Amino acid sequence: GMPHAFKPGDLVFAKMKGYPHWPARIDDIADGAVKPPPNKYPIFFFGTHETAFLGPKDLFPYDKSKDKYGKPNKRKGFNEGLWEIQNNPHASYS
């Protein structure tokens, strides 16, 4: 097939119910691990230990959205996650 819209390493803000748009990346599925439902992706939330499966309606490509969503807030882990996406977005995190 053609390349998917999102691929491992892509940076986003990801939206979950109850939470502000959160700095995140598309992760690899580990060898042998559960794969997402169709047209979903494993999303690693910077500043957290959360990986969740989300679809595109909840994914805001980082460059388009950073001016609006890339602003400090005091949710736990948020500003740490902003630091990570800005300063070391491709490091090992878990």
UniProtKB/Swiss-Prot annotation:
Residues 8-65 form the PWWP domain. It comes from the Eukaryota. Changing residue 22 to A: Loss of interaction with histone H3K36me2. Widely expressed. High expression is found in heart, skeletal muscle, ovary and testis. Overexpression is frequently observed in hepatocellular carcinoma samples. It is found in: Nucleus; Cytoplasm. Interacts with HDGF. Interacts with trimethylated 'Lys-36' of histone H3 (H3K36me3). Interacts with trimethylated 'Lys-79' of histone H3 (H3K79me3), but has higher affinity for H3K36me3. Interacts with IWS1. Interacts with H2AX, POGZ, RBBP8 and CBX1. Interacts with histones H3K9me3, H3K27me3 and H3K36me2. Interacts with DPF3a (isoform 2 of DPF3/BAF45C). Interacts with SMARCA4/BRG1/BAF190A, SMARCC1/BAF155 and SMARCD1/BAF60A in a DPF3a-dependent manner. Belongs to the HDGF family. Acts as an epigenetic regulator of myogenesis in cooperation with DPF3a (isoform 2 of DPF3/BAF45C). Associates with the BAF complex via its interaction with DPF3a and HDGFL2-DPF3a activate myogenic genes by increasing chromatin accessibility through recruitment of SMARCA4/BRG1/BAF190A (ATPase subunit of the BAF complex) to myogenic gene promoters. Promotes the repair of DNA double-strand breaks (DSBs) through the homologous recombination pathway by facilitating the recruitment of the DNA endonuclease RBBP8 to the DSBs. This is Hepatoma-derived growth factor-related protein 2.
